Amino acid sequence: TSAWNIFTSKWGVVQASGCLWTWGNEFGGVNGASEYTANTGGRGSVYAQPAAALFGGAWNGTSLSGSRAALWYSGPSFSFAFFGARGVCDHLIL
Amino acid sequence: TSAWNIFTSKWGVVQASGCLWTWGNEFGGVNGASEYTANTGGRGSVYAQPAAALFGGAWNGTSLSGSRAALWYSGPSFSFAFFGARGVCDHLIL
Amino acid sequence: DWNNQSIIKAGERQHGIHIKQSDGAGVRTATGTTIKVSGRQAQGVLLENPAAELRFQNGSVTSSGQLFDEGVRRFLGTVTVKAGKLVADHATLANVSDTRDDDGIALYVAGEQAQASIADSTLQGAGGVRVERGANVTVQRSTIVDGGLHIGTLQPLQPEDLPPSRVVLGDTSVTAVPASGAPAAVSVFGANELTVDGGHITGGRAAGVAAMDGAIVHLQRATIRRGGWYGVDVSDSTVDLAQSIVEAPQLGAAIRAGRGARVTVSGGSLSAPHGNVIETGGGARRFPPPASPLSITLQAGARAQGRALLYRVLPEPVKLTLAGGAQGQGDIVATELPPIPGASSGPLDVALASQARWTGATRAVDSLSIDNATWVMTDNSNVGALRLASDGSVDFQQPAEAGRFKVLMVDTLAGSGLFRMNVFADLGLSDKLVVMRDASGQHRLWVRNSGSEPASANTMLLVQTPRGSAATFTLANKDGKVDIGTYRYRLAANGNGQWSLVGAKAPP
Numbered sequence A, B: 001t002s003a004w005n006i007f008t009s010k011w012g013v014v015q016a017s018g019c020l021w022t023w024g025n026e027f028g029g030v031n032g033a034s035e036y037t038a039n040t041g042g043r044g045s046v047y048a049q050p051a052a053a054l055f056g057g058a059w060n061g062t063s064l065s066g067s068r069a070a071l072w073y074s075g076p077s078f079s080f081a082f083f084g085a086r087g088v089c090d091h092l093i094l
Numbered sequence C: 001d002w003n004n005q006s007i008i009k010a011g012e013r014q015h016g017i018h019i020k021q022s023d024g025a026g027v028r029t030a031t032g033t034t035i036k037v038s039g040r041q042a043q044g045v046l047l048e049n050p051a052a053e054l055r056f057q058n059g060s061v062t063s064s065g066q067l068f069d070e071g072v073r074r075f076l077g078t079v080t081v082k083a084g085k086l087v088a089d090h091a092t093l094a095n096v097s098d099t100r101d102d103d104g105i106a107l108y109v110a111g112e113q114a115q116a117s118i119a120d121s122t123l124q125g126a127g128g129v130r131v132e133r134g135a136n137v138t139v140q141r142s143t144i145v146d147g148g149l150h151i152g153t154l155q156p157l158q159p160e161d162l163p164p165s166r167v168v169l170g171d172t173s174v175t176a177v178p179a180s181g182a183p184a185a186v187s188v189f190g191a192n193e194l195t196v197d198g199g200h201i202t203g204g205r206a207a208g209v210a211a212m213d214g215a216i217v218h219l220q221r222a223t224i225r226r227g228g229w230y231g232v233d234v235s236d237s238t239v240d241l242a243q244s245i246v247e248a249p250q251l252g253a254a255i256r257a258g259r260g261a262r263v264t265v266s267g268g269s270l271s272a273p274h275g276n277v278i279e280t281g282g283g284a285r286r287f288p289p290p291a292s293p294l295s296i297t298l299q300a301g302a303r304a305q306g307r308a309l310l311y312r313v314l315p316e317p318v319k320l321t322l323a324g325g326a327q328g329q330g331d332i333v334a335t336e337l338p339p340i341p342g343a344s345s346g347p348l349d350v351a352l353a354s355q356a357r358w359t360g361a362t363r364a365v366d367s368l369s370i371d372n373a374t375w376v377m378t379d380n381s382n383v384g385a386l387r388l389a390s391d392g393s394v395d396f397q398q399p400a401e402a403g404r405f406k407v408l409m410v411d412t413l414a415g416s417g418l419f420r421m422n423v424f425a426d427l428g429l430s431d432k433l434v435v436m437r438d439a440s441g442q443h444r445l446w447v448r449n450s451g452s453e454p455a456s457a458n459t460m461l462l463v464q465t466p467r468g469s470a471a472t473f474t475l476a477n478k479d480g481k482v483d484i485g486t487y488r489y490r491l492a493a494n495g496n497g498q499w500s501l502v503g504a505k506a507p508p
């Protein structure tokens, strides 16, 4: 109900918010089972695992979405069809 | 009640601690409402939003302040006159 | 319709009894009809018709398959009602499976037209009973063996629309075994109602009962034990405790409330031998408007015992109220340091009313008001604003150690009350009441002899007040005197509001 370019950022980030939650590289918020759970696709267990951040909001999100929309509920092993990712890296000057 | 230079780091960081809390770039500690809150200067909504670290202590936590002093209570939308910031960045050798 | 049969469907996604959304529109019924479904993603009973009523008696519905729908990835139960009425009588509903694979939900009622009335039945599997999304359930004389009861949830990644769920329990007994992982034995999230009438709520990883995000929970003649754990955990929602009993371990509290919670305890009992009876805070929600400053009321003869009667988590305001002859012995403590040095903190306000009785000590209470009640003070104490009325008293407790006096310090004093105080005449020492900023009103002092036979007659300071305070005190021992051995003492105010007890040799 809104055109893709409605969500284009100052620096031309396309679909910046309100389309998909992007996984973040921060941990905090809702923790999970306070006992060693094996949910890392067979690569060990996690104890009292903090949620991974998700930013921007998704298409369903309504008016929650935006440049600062943040959801600290989902564990790193959760998966949903509105959870994607965007990439970042440092600026190199030489 | 004590002079500014009492709070001067080994590296010449002036008022290193116990003058003003600096906001940090790490999340954890006390979470906010486990429910969507539009408190982001009107740029989306947070959910189970963890505290954003505060470091050093301010002028009025006497014994509490110091190089490892850390408060994980304040939501990122909190605003007080004991909360400022100190910048950092990488060291580049070429 | 179904009689003494043995419907077993190992068939995958094959439901023991299924009633189609547009099947026949009428009353079904089944007796002694034991069911078993091993087929993965297939419930024992699935009811889906807003017009069909299913009656299930003396049977036994069980499933082993890994149940769950991909209609927003929520994992169903061995009997699921999504539309229509279910009537269960003397039934076993079991769900055997895995931890990681299945949740083990025995009963699942969800939807604006989903109804269930479990009577004399028993439900098991590590998922328990789950109700949500506008459903109505009534459970009587039954057992939730291991999975617990769970009404509603928090945000399923989207806006929660409205329609409330109502659940009524007639002396059943809900348990949540440590094995089941479940965080609370009973839990109500969102705008939903639970009425409990008698029974044993036992279990929970973290709490016995959890009510959050606007729940209404009426617990009546329930009994709540573990089997740091909390008995009842509240939020921004209403919890009422009538004639119930709540016990808590050392590491815990009988009640935790925070974020604008409203708790009423009438009758019953709350004990926490080595912990707190009531805890306040731990989950930050900061708004400048004074909403419903989280309040706890112990009324109608409530009993409450622990190492502290109220522990405040700091930087939320609290309003503790003992009324209707309730009695609580604890201590009332705060954290000493606030989280943010130099910001506003609201008050810790206690109100002792109609016949009530707190027995303890404090240096955390901001504003205490005793009114036709009594604070039996057990040790040195600090209160901001003290206010009395209608025979409100502050009974200094008689020390077991002779010579050991207690002191109450107050910022401001107002109204009119009585103070029972201890006197050690032979030592020339007495309990003291110090008011530091402002004193006013008519107060009465009643002296208790607690160190008999004085060598001489010697003055003993009893009350200290500011400048030229407006407060009057009068010795309430009859005839305005106390006879300690062969000596008579009277109260005299001297200079700048300092009321001493003078006395000399008693008239022959």
Ligand SMILES: [Mg+2]
Binding pocket: A025, A026, A027, B025, B026, B027
């Ligand atoms: Mg980090």
